[PDB]
């Protein structure tokens, strides 16, 4: 038995994050797309 389920049986339950790994990776793709194509204007107004 893994330690995750072992610690859960004593009240130590881990809450899942709001932003998943897929949603965080999509935020990084928007930053890269804005940095390569727009430069520094996508953070100080329109792209």
């Amino acid at each position: 038995r893994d330690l995750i389920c072992a610690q859960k049986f004593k009240g130590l339950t881990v809450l899942p994050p709001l932003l998943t790994d897929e949603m965080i990776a999509q935020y990084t793709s928007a930053l890269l797309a804005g940095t390569i194509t727009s430069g520094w204007t996508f953070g100080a107004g329109p792209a």
Binding site: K8, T13, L15, P16
Partner: peptide, 29 residues
């Protein structure tokens, strides 16, 4: 999950750490 007493009185219940079997119904992560 309460949208506010001034708005309505309907509430949703989220049982953290269950698979909708050992408790609309929608199983989340």
């Amino acid at each position: 999950i309460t949208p506010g007493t001034n708005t309505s009185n309907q509430v949703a219940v989220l049982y953290q750490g269950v698979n909708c079997t050992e408790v609309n119904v929608f199983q989340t992560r």
